[PDB]
């Protein structure tokens, strides 16, 4: 309801959130995942990413 | 953690100073009406103006007048 | 909680057509998808519901999920009106 | 006693509250009575300084008169619905219903139209 | 009466290989029954997607890494064939997982 409740957060760390946790630390944006690498590391096998070499 | 600062002065949301039958409009006869101040030009009648020292503003359109009355 | 009551009625109405609601975990958002209110106000409304009976809540992947229970359907009918044989997602519309 | 004691006006206010078509309050009644919305008007008897009673008299007589006596305001508010839950039955915390104006109507025919005809035509 | 050849390209892109190769074999066998002029199952380079990541959450202990990668198998089956025979070969030969897709415009 108040007017000034928002800095321009178009870009950088503060804008780019993750899909899962809502974190600004170790964020995979590669191939547009938008996932903090630790949740990715949990679900990687689910999302098609397998350890081969 | 480190200790908090404590200047002193705190500011709370105003309670507004509510009032009812408040206190515009009149009737002399009984049947007909005699409106005080004026109604809004922009929106329909029923909404009234705010009378100050040569400055007006409405409520339904937050604060949008300029001309005197 | 301090909601202009017109915006709240729209959210209830929009809830009852769907029988379902997919809200983000995104406060400070100017307007919600589909409904013409802030996302935060929809989440406050669906927070207010969950407490007094109703409304089965999840919080996975920054998306809240709210389905209306049997008593949830009864109270949304009480708020709006619509008496009986109505939309939600308890039963199908025709053949789908 | 099968005949209604002005209980075909309260039934309009219930259906109006149910279908979302009530203009309760002092100003909403005036906005309802100006343009094509407010069809039936409801003004309080027990009014201090005679101000709010005299206003709706004028709003009624401005174009189309839709007014009636009303039973002391508090009874209409209890009859329509002013209180969430209120235990199993009754036990609603008393509220003065203020000035009210009916929008939409919704329900058709019945005793409500009979009371409107007798008060209008004279 | 028509016999209007639009020249249609089929897109097969997927992770799994043994499904994809079986799907690709099924379409050419349908082309052999319907007897059409077609270029065979062309095989484009496999875009391997490499997400490099430290194994840890905390960033403490030894500095280990996991190349979480994704295989992709991009294939083509170009048809010199009409619109109606393509509508048939889209309806049948559908397996789960493999992304069947049609370009249709030469
Ligand atoms: Mg401090
Ligand atoms: Zn204005």
From TrEMBL, chain C:
What keywords does the record list, in alphabetical order? Cytoplasm, Ribonucleoprotein, Ribosomal protein
Q: Which Gene3D superfamilies match?
A: Winged helix-like DNA-binding domain superfamily/Winged helix DNA-binding domain
Per the UniProt record, one Pfam family is: S10_plectin
TM region(s), chain numbering: none
Question: One GO term of the cellular component aspect?
Answer: cytosolic small ribosomal subunit
Which PANTHER family does this UniProt record tie to the protein? 40S RIBOSOMAL PROTEIN S10, RIBOSOMAL PROTEIN S10
Q: What's its job?
A: Component of the ribosome, a large ribonucleoprotein complex responsible for the synthesis of proteins in the cell. The small ribosomal subunit (SSU) binds messenger RNAs (mRNAs) and translates the encoded message by selecting cognate aminoacyl-transfer RNA (tRNA) molecules. The large subunit (LSU) contains the ribosomal catalytic site termed the peptidyl transferase center (PTC), which catalyzes the formation of peptide bonds, thereby polymerizing the amino acids delivered by tRNAs into a polypeptide chain.
User: What family is this protein classified in?
Assistant: Belongs to the eukaryotic ribosomal protein eS10 family.
Q: What is this protein called?
A: KLLA0B08173p
Source organism: Kluyveromyces lactis (strain ATCC 8585 / CBS 2359 / DSM 70799 / NBRC 1267 / NRRL Y-1140 / WM37) (Yeast)
TrEMBL record, chain D:
A GO molecular function held by the record: structural constituent of ribosome
* Record-linked PANTHER family: 40S RIBOSOMAL PROTEIN S12 (PTHR11843)
Q: Which family does the record assign? A: Belongs to the eukaryotic ribosomal protein eS12 family.
What Gene3D superfamilies has UniProt attached to this entry? 3.30.1330.30
Keywords associated with the record = Ribonucleoprotein, Ribosomal protein
InterPro entries on file: Ribosomal_eL30-like_sf, Ribosomal_eL8/eL30/eS12/Gad45, Ribosomal_eS12, Ribosomal_eS12_CS
Q: Which GO terms describe its cellular component?
A: ribonucleoprotein complex; ribosome
Ribosomal protein eL8/eL30/eS12/Gadd45 domain ranges (all copies): 8-101
By what name is this protein known? 40S ribosomal protein S12
Task: Please list the GO biological process terms of this entry.
Answer: translation
UniProtKB/TrEMBL annotation, chain E:
- Where the record annotates domain Small ribosomal subunit protein uS10, the positions are 9-103
Give the top-rank taxon of the lineage listed in the UniProt record for this protein. Answer: Eukaryota
Q: Which GO terms describe its biological process?
A: translation
Q: Name one Pfam family in it.
A: Ribosomal_S10
Any one cellular component term from GO for this entry? small ribosomal subunit
Q: Which InterPro entries match?
A: Ribosomal_uS10 (IPR001848), Ribosomal_uS10_dom (IPR027486), Ribosomal_uS10_dom_sf (IPR036838), Ribosomal_uS10_euk/arc (IPR005729)
**From the UniProt record, which GO molecular function terms apply?**
structural constituent of ribosome
Q: Show the stretches that span the lipid bilayer.
A: none
List keywords of the entry alphabetically. Ribonucleoprotein, Ribosomal protein
Q: Family assignment? A: Belongs to the universal ribosomal protein uS10 family.
Protein name as annotated: Small ribosomal subunit protein uS10
Source species of the chain: Kluyveromyces lactis (strain ATCC 8585 / CBS 2359 / DSM 70799 / NBRC 1267 / NRRL Y-1140 / WM37) (Yeast)
């Amino acid at each position: 309801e108040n007017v000034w409740y928002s800095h321009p957060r178009k870009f950088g760390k503060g804008s780019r959130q993750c899909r899962i946790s809502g974190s600004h630390s170790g964020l995979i944006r590669k191939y547009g995942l938008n996932i903090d690498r630790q949740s990715f590391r949990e679900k990687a096998n689910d999302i098609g990413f397998y350890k081969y070499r | 953690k480190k200790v908090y600062t404590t200047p002193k002065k705190i500011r709370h949301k105003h309670k507004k100073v509510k009032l009812a039958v408040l206190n515009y409009y009149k009737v002399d006869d009984e049947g007909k009406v005699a409106k005080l101040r004026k109604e809004c030009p922009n929106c329909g009648p029923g909404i009234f103006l705010a009378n100050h020292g040569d400055r007006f503003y409405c409520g339904k359109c937050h604060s949008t007048f300029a001309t005197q009355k | 909680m301090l909601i202009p009551k017109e915006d709240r009625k729209k959210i209830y109405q929009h809830l009852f057509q769907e029988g379902v609601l997919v809200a983000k975990k995104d406060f400070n958002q100017p307007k919600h998808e589909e409904i013409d209110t802030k996302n935060l106000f929809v989440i406050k409304a669906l927070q207010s519901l969950t407490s007094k009976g109703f409304v089965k809540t999840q919080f996975s992947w920054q998306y809240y999920y709210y389905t209306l229970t049997e008593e949830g359907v009864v109270y949304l009918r009480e708020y709006l009106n619509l008496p009986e044989h109505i939309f939600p997602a308890t039963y199908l519309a025709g053949q789908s | 006693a099968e005949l209604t004691i002005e209980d075909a006006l309260k039934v309009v206010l219930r259906t109006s509250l149910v279908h979302d078509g009530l203009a309760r309050g002092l100003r909403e009644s005036a906005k309802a009575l100006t343009r094509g919305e407010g069809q039936l008007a409801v003004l309080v008897e027990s009014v201090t300084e005679e101000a709010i009673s005299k206003l709706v008299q004028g709003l009624a007589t401005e174009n189309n008169v839709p007014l009636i006596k009303v039973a002391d305001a508090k009874q209409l508010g209890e009859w329509a619905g002013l209180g969430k839950i209120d235990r199993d039955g009754n036990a609603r915390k008393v509220v003065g219903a203020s000035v009210v104006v009916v929008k939409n109507w919704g329900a058709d025919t019945q005793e409500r139209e009979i009371l409107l005809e007798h008060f209008s035509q004279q | 009466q028509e016999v209007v050849i639009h020249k249609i390209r089929i897109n097969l892109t997927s992770t799994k290989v043994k499904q994809l190769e079986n799907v690709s074999a099924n379409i050419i066998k349908n082309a052999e029954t319907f007897k059409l002029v077609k270029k065979g199952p062309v095989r484009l380079p496999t875009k391997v997607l490499k997400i490099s990541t430290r194994k840890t959450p905390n960033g403490e202990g030894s500095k280990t890494w996991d190349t979480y990668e994704m295989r992709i198998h991009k294939r083509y089956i170009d048809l010199e064939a009409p619109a109606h025979i393509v509508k048939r070969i889209t309806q049948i030969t559908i397996e789960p997982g493999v992304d069947v897709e049609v370009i249709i415009a030469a």
